Design a protein around this ligand. Structure first.
Ligand SMILES: [Mg+2]
Ligand SMILES: [Mg+2]
Ligand SMILES: [Mg+2]
Ligand SMILES: [Mg+2]
Ligand SMILES: [Mg+2]
Ligand SMILES: [Mg+2]
Ligand SMILES: [Mg+2]
Lengths: 238, 240, 196, 204, 198, 233, 222, 222
């Protein structure tokens, strides 16, 4: 209860905050290419009265940085905005476009500050940033509400975390490298959908999903149509 | 569970649920995205014979191209509209070009957003439906107390939302190519009547507005007058 | 100082010199007076150095930020942004600045935000220290829209004569082609325009 | 309409083989009218020395301001302020007031208690640092001082000789400057011991 | 400008200060004391800008008296003059400086010796054997340089000063309407009121 | 304080039996230069008002924005916005004036001379000046800066007083007002040939008669002038 | 640089009749050597049987009046429509006027009405605040052409009883309103004849214990 | 005040004299107009001395803080943008013109900023009073692609130009070099053309020539 230390120093509002990130109910996964990066998220559209265009958990922050978030849409659109502008203000104030790993710092920084000074309740969302910067290439860093980020060679956010995970882990103990060997994104994409389908004991149509790709400085969201064609691709080859 | 900022043992903000709970309790509002432009309608409830008709408007325009309506706590609605009014007019002065409906929602979503962050403030007690046009077509969204909103083919809140919902459901399939600008109105006129059957012992007054490059001419005009009447009668026949 | 921007059938192209003078001396006879704010939106700076430079920087910022949320912005949507900056501060600013941009829909537009802040959509505009002698040519020798190469000459000769009678403006020529195709970076060395 | 030139005064310093020296006149007066002949432009903070020319109140205010700060330094750091360090400071200090500048001309000099290296510096009213290895001059007769020093400085003098040189340098330039004089004083800084001397001069 | 003199002697200090007050043309009061005792043994004569003058003095006065009852112990001439200089130092770079010059005479009881501090409006202080702000020095400084001796009795000083005056009268353009003279010593302050009949 | 950059010249106007008129050429000068041959100096507000602005274009464009932006603002929550409750000329001006004053009172004005014209819902004529200094006045005739010295004269031959308005036919008004417009072009360096006139009659309404030329001029006699005193041949 | 002030001619006039009061002032309006409007009222009723006028610089003028007419209104709201005794109004104006001391209202203002006894009363104002209870004051351009006259006619200045040698000054007597308005019109005509900034028309507000009357008389359009 | 900068096939070099004036007087015979912003980015600055220094100190100070936090490396334009955003925020009141130059994990860089906020770029830039002589030298002896040797030789011979034909500049030469893969070498006084010749007589005085009135042994610590 409230934002100041427990008897075992663990102020739960931060802890509670987490369940809510998860609670949304969507699964987000991400992996590195070789000259590209990719994230998978599900696109469950219940109400037959909405419009799938307006739905999404992935947005174009920068010309090259995209973001996915397993978390409640209102709080996300916020984080989206601030971040979206921090980079905007950055390029201006410093001469060069802001990289993945950094945004995630002021971002975690920000969520830490809130938390400690009490100027608002933490947002209940986990942000997963992606891109490729010409200093560390395929970059992937994640941030949580307890104001904190780190690095992933490929990650996942969702109700079923460790499952999506373990698969990749096993696929990694064998592929032995710390990323996905392959030149084309289409091909990598195929790979992830693959590793997710296998991971849910579930199948997806051409609208049941949501995916994004980070290239050599030209990040773009995968749309309804192009999305299906990868299912075509990965049907026989399986 | 009693403060606005706080979270429940498994991540939940109760004050917002009750916010929602009050949104339902009020009158019913709807809206529909058609060929080009949109159509809205609300439920003014005549509680006595001492109410001047054609008077207390619940629907409001923004700029000169955005329709807008809601339900729940009436003053909350009004308040929210003002902020939306500044934001719009400020933007306009800045970029010259009338404000894109897509972003507009956020500007508002972001403002409704805040009132879920601090304990010293009260969550917005209204669900809001709206839309308008631009260059790349007409749009229509619906904002709730949580601040979460989206784009719908038609929306509904307040008391009987299902009535109009399943009602909106049909239209989709028989007219999977957008309903006629004209028919849109008269159809809305009906969808309301049907959903009113709770305040049935108590008479009422229906209000309608719309947008369309062909009909309104890019603008938002109040459906009043002749088209207004027949649109009622139209509803009055199917009302059996 | 000597700039301008002209519209035609495939869009619009803007060009200017390279000469910048502090007193009767040449500070940097190789200036990139043409500046980019957005991919299909650029501008040519006139008058004050330091001022014009900074304005752009700010604008570039607003737009590159606009897009990240409101999609890609118009050419008119861009002018207004300079309107504000120029206006508000008319007292500590010296700027002739001409803006130009293209969009498939409305073709390419040309707007001039002269000193004071007054904005204008013209067929083509011309500002800068030596604009004063091409009021004769330009207006008279102007057919409504032309061809890619056909237009490149208006630019070429308008610019040529301006060097011939105005020392404060000179150096090389530089054009920027904004079209459906995309951006094309031109450059016409001396011994050329003089010959004409 | 120059402030620096209202009160008068000069200060000069030189570096000898293993020591330093710094002297100043004594006169203080509003333009023509001479007022004091017991006004000293040189003080110190432990083992560090500062000579300041220019506008009188500003001089005083500075001394106070520096005594203040050095006391506070030596306290939290349990060690007296070092020369090179002081310089960098008085430097910044002058600048903090870069738009309401203090009309002065400081000159620092001392002996570093670790390396044992002689030190001298000079600055303009805003804190620009003039590192030198021979001599520093500031004040009314700046130009007359450079004329002396340029002839007389000899790399590495013996303290007993350096005294005689600097004394004469100061002393003589002071007579061709109408706004400085009425006595002078010279200090000689050795590793340990320090000798203060007042000299006899024209009193006009 | 006006006349402000002061001279430190044996076991006392003496302050002279003209009496007239002028408004462009006419002369209003001509029996005006430009003095203000700060504490039982400290005193301050002053001359300066019309309003700036009398305000500042009283203000300084206030602070002191305050300090002196708060502590119950009296403040030393040395330290006093230090503070006055402090205040003017700021004053000079204030949005509006108090344009005022002063002389401060006091008897330091611990040293059992008399101290005299001259201070201009720029915040320029100096302990002196004697002084005078403004044009007042030019006409007199010589006679003082001449006859002054540190050992002079209280009377010796008056005579001297008296002579300085006779001169100021003789060669000064302005009519200062005479002078009020005052002495600070181990006994405190008293006024040589007799300088009219003397 | 500030200085004017681009300049609109005059704006003439007068009243008549039914309504009022207001003309103003389409030239925006940059000192002695004419960098803009076709620019609008008449913003009609609503359909019972128009505003002839004369001075700085940069400033004039700002106002425009205030009007459109005020207009769109009247709508907001008020159904009668096209009939009962809707901007009268008297209003706008009142608000306009208000502004011009705050401005001079804030030592930073809008370099402009302005005329507000139209007709009141109840049928009355409205014509009132208002300039950067926040000064105003009604009169049967009104002209900005350059106008008033040269136009007003002729306009006063049609209406020496208030007791002539009733008998001032809409056509007599026009032609005269245009003869004036020919004259403004005959002796004024800051003036243009193209222009925009507008009428607001209580019967017909608003009639924005944009872009016209100034015709019929006696120049022939030019040929007869030679020298300046002696030069005969 | 920018010059924030200007002069629009005009001349106003106030006479305190025994039991009435007049505030007259012409209708011309000027700029340089040009005309602005043949008819433009500078004298107003502000309610509570109180007339005002401020001549000098139009804008500062009408703004003061406006700013005042409002300050009257508000006086009623807070004191239950208590009437504003003329004396009161003036003390009030002083402040208004003095509010803008270091950026004054470039105008000579005057008011007239009745006191708490029924006697006429006029009040002349400084451009920043000094007010005087005058029984007769002309302000404006022509000022110096009319004041000398009223001096004479209204107060019989320099006029003695014949045959008394010059020992008996002619006694003052109070003139009916008719009598006053005759003087007033003559004053203005004379003034128009010899002053360019003055002519056209004359609007007079007459205050009496039952209202405000307005009468107009045309001057020369010289 | 006389400085330049020229980039070659694998880097860039800036040089500046060592004389600081003061009206007609020479204040410092040995000053370093070459300051370090960061290991690879350095500056040379003319005009108002105290301004030029303090400013780089400031910027160098921040850029360090930046790189640390970002864990990456100092980009040249970062420094440029920092400078001119602050630099112009004080509309001219900080006379400092300079040739900013260094190397970042993306190339060799060279720019010139004026005291108002103006920034330029070319292959060679000169700022200072003798900016003309050293300009004329580089405008006849410059060819694309010069080497560590070609370029160096030039830069130093440009500086030399000012040192001789322009008054406001003199003494020795200062140089600094940044290579696209290699370090940075600070060469204080790569040259020493001006050196005072050995004096004529020996001016050392015979001990006891100066008259002393008093003497003692002043105090220091507690
Ligand atoms: Mg809270
Ligand atoms: Mg040329
Ligand atoms: Mg000097
Ligand atoms: Mg001397
Ligand atoms: Mg009363
Ligand atoms: Mg006349
Ligand atoms: Mg030289």
């Amino acid at each position: 209860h409230i934002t100041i230390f427990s008897p075992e120093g663990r102020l739960y509002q931060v802890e509670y905050a987490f369940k809510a990130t998860n609670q949304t109910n969507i699964n987000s996964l991400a992996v590195r290419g070789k000259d590209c990066t990719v994230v998978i998220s599900q696109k469950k559209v219940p109400d037959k009265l909405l419009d799938p265009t307006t739905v999404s958990y992935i947005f174009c922050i920068s010309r090259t940085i995209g973001m996915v978030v397993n978390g409640p849409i209102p709080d996300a659109r916020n984080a989206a905005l601030r971040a979206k502008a921090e980079a905007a203000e950055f390029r201006y104030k410093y001469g060069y476009d802001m990289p993945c790993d950094v945004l995630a710092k002021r971002m975690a920084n920000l969520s830490q500050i809130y938390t400690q000074r009490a100027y608002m309740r933490p947002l209940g969302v986990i942000l997963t940033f992606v891109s490729v910067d010409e200093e560390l290439g395929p970059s992937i860093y994640k941030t949580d509400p307890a104001g904190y980020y780190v690095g992933y060679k490929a990650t996942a956010t969702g109700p079923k975390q460790q499952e999506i995970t373990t698969n990749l882990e096993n696929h990694f103990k064998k592929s032995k490298i710390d990323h996905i060997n392959e030149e084309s994104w289409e091909k990598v994409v195929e790979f992830a959908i693959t590793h997710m389908i296998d991971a849910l004991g579930t199948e997806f149509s051409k609208n049941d999903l949501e995916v994004g790709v980070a290239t050599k400085d030209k990040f773009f969201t995968l749309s309804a149509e192009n999305i299906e064609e990868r299912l075509v691709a990965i049907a026989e080859q399986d | 569970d009693l403060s606005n900022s706080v979270f429940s043992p498994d991540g939940r903000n109760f004050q917002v649920e009750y916010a929602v709970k009050a949104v339902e309790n009020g009158t019913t509002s709807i809206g529909i995205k058609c060929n080009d432009g949109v159509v809205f309608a609300v439920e003014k409830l005549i509680t006595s014979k001492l109410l001047v008709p054609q008077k207390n408007v619940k629907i409001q325009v923004v700029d000169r191209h955005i329709g807008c309506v809601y339900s729940g706590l009436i003053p909350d609605g009004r308040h929210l509209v003002n902020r939306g009014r500044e934001e719009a007019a400020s933007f306009k002065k800045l970029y010259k070009t009338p404000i894109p409906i897509p972003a507009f929602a956020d500007r508002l979503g972001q403002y409704v957003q805040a009132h879920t962050l601090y304990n010293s403030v009260r969550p917005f007690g209204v669900s809001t439906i709206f839309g308008g046009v631009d260059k790349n077509g007409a749009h229509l969204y619906m904002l709730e107390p949580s601040g979460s909103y989206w784009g719908y083919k038609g929306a509904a809140t307040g008391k009987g939302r299902q009535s109009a919902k399943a009602e909106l459901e049909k239209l989709v399939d028989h007219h999977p190519e957008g309903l006629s600008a004209r028919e849109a109105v008269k159809q809305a006129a009906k969808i309301i009547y049907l959903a009113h059957e709770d305040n049935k012992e108590k008479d009422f007054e229906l209000e309608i507005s719309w947008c369309s490059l062909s009909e309104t001419n890019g603008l938002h005009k109040f459906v009043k007058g002749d088209l207004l009447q027949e649109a009622i009668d139209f509803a009055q026949k199917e009302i059996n | 100082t000597s700039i301008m921007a002209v519209t035609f059938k495939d869009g619009v192209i803007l060009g200017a010199d390279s000469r910048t003078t502090t007193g009767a001396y040449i500070a940097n006879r190789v200036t990139d007076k043409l500046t980019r704010v957005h991919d299909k939106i650029w501008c040519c700076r006139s008058g004050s150095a330091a001022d014009t430079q900074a304005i752009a920087d700010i604008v570039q910022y607003h737009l590159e930020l606009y897009t990240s949320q409101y999609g890609t912005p118009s050419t008119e949507t861009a002018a207004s942004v300079f309107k504000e900056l120029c206006y508000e501060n008319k007292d500590n600013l010296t700027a002739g600045i001409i803006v130009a941009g293209y969009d498939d829909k409305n073709k390419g537009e040309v707007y001039t935000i002269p000193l004071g802040g007054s904005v204008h959509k013209l067929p083509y505009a011309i500002a800068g220290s030596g604009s004063t002698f091409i009021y004769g040519y330009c207006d008279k020798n102007f057919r409504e829209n032309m061809s890619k190469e056909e237009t490149v000459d208006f630019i070429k000769h308008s610019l040529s004569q301006a060097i011939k009678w105005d020392g404060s403006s000179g150096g090389v020529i530089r054009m920027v082609v904004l079209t459906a195709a995309g951006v094309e970076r031109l450059i016409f060395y001396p011994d050329e325009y003089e010959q004409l | 309409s120059d402030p620096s030139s209202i009160n008068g005064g000069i200060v000069v310093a030189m570096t000898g083989k293993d020591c330093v020296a710094i002297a100043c006149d004594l006169r203080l007066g509003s333009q023509s009218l001479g007022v004091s002949n017991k006004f000293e432009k040189i003080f110190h903070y432990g083992h560090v020395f500062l000579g300041i020319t220019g506008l009188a109140t500003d001089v005083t205010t500075l001394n106070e301001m520096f005594r203040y700060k050095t006391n506070l330094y030596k306290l939290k750091e349990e060690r007296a302020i070092e020369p090179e360090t002081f310089t960098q400071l008085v430097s910044s200090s002058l600048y903090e007031r870069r738009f309401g500048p203090y009309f002065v001309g400081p000159v620092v000099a001392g002996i570093n208690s670790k390396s044992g290296k002689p030190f001298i510096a000079g600055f303009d009213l805003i804190g620009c640092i003039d590192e030198a290895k021979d001599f520093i001059v500031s004040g009314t007769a700046s130009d007359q001082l450079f004329g002396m020093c340029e002839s007389l400085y000899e790399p590495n003098l013996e303290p007993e000789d350096l005294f005689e040189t600097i004394s004469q340098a100061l002393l003589n330039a002071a007579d061709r400057d109408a706004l400085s004089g009425w006595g002078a004083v010279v200090y000689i800084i050795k590793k340990d011991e320090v000798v203060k001397r007042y000299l006899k001069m024209r009193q006009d | 400008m006006d006349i402000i003199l002061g001279i430190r002697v044996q076991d006392s200090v003496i302050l002279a200060s003209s009496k007239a007050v002028t408004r462009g043309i006419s002369v209003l009061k001509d029996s005006d004391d430009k003095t203000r005792q700060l504490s039982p043994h400290t005193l301050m004569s002053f001359a300066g800008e019309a309003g700036d003058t009398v305000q500042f003095a009283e203000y300084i006065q206030a602070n002191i008296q305050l300090y002196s009852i708060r502590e119950d112990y009296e403040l030393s001439p040395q330290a006093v003059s230090s503070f006055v200089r402090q205040e003017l130092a700021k004053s000079i770079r204030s949005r509006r400086p108090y344009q005022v010059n002063v002389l401060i005479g006091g008897y330091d009881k611990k040293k059992n010796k008399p101290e005299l501090y001259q201070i201009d409006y720029l915040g320029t202080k100096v302990e002196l054997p004697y002084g005078a702000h403004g044009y007042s020095g030019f006409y007199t400084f010589s006679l003082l340089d001449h006859h002054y001796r540190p050992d002079m009795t209280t009377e010796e000083g008056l005579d001297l000063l008296k002579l300085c005056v006779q001169e100021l009268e003789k060669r000064m353009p302005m009519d200062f309407k005479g002078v009020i003279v005052k002495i600070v010593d181990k006994d405190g302050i008293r006024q040589v009121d007799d300088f009219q009949a003397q | 304080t500030q200085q004017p950059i681009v300049t609109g010249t005059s704006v003439i106007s007068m009243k008549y039996d039914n309504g009022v008129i207001i003309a103003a050429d389409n030239l925006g000068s940059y000192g002695s230069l004419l960098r803009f041959n076709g620019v609008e100096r008449l913003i009609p507000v609503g359909d019972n008002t128009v505003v002839g602005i004369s001075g700085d274009i940069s400033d004039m464009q700002h106002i425009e924005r205030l009007l459109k932006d005020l207009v769109t603002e009247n709508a907001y929550d008020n159904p009668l916005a096209d009939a009962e409750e809707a901007l009268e000329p008297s209003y706008i001006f009142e608000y306009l004036a208000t502004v011009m004053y705050q401005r001079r009172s804030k030592m930073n004005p809008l370099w402009n001379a302005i005329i507000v014209a139209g007709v009141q819902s109840n049928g009355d004529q409205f014509l009132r000046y208002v300039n950067l200094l926040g000064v105003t006045y009604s009169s049967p005739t009104l002209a900005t800066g350059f106008g008033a010295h040269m136009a007003n004269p002729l306009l006063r031959k049609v209406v020496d007083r208030e007791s002539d308005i009733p008998k001032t036919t809409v056509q007599v008004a026009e032609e005269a007002i245009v003869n004036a417009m020919r004259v403004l072009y005959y002796r004024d360096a800051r003036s243009s040939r193209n222009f925009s006139l507008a009428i607001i009659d209580k019967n017909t309404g608003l009639t924005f008669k944009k872009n016209l030329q100034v015709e019929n001029m006696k120049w022939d006699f030019a040929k007869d002038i030679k020298g300046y005193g002696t030069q005969k041949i | 640089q920018f010059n924030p002030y200007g002069d629009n001619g005009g001349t106003i006039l106030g006479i305190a009749g025994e039991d009435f009061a007049v505030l007259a002032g012409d209708t011309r309006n000027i700029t340089d050597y040009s005309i602005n409007s043949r008819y433009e009222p500078k004298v107003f009723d502000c309610g509570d049987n109180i007339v005002m006028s401020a001549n000098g610089f139009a804008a500062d003028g009408d703004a003061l009046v406006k700013r005042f007419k409002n300050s009257v209104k508000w006086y009623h709201f807070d004191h239950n429509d208590k009437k504003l005794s003329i004396n009161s109004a003036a003390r009030n104006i002083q402040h208004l006027l003095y509010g803008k001391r270091f950026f004054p209202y470039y105008v000579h203002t005057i008011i007239a009405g009745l006191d708490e006894d029924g006697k006429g009363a006029v009040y002349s104002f400084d451009p920043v605040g000094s007010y005087e209870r005058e029984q007769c004051r002309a302000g404006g351009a022509a000022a110096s052409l009319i004041m000398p006259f009223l001096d004479n006619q209204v107060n019989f200045k320099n006029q003695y009883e014949p045959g008394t040698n010059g020992k008996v000054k002619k006694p003052l007597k109070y003139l009916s309103v008719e009598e006053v308005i005759k003087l007033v019109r003559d004053s203005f005509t004379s003034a128009t004849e010899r002053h360019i900034q003055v002519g056209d028309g004359l609007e007079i507000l007459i205050v009496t214990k039952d209202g405000v009357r307005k009468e107009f008389y045309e001057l020369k359009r010289d | 005040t006389t400085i330049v900068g020229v980039k070659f096939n694998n880097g860039v070099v800036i040089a500046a004299d060592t004389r600081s004036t003061q009206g007609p007087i020479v204040a410092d015979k040995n000053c370093a107009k070459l300051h370090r912003i960061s290991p690879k980015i350095w500056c040379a600055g003319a005009g108002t001395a105290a301004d030029t220094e303090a400013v780089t100190q400031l910027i160098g100070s921040n850029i360090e803080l930046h790189s640390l936090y970002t864990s990456r490396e100092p980009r040249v334009v970062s420094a440029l943008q920092m400078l001119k955003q602050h630099l112009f925020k004080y509309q001219g009141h900080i006379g400092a013109y300079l040739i900013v130059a260094g190397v970042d994990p993306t190339g060799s860089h060279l720019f010139s900023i004026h005291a108002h906020g103006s920034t330029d770029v070319g292959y060679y830039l000169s700022l200072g009073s003798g900016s003309l002589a050293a300009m004329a030298v580089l405008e006849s002896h410059w060819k694309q692609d010069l080497t560590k040797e070609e370029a160096i030789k030039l830069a130093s011979d440009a500086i030399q130009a000012g040192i001789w034909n322009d008054l406001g500049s003199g003494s020795n030469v200062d140089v600094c070099v940044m290579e696209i893969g290699k370090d940075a070498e600070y060469l204080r006084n790569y040259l020493t053309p001006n050196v005072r010749e050995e004096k004529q007589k020996s001016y050392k005085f015979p001990r006891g020539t100066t008259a002393v009135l008093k003497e003692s042994i002043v105090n220091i610590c507690d």
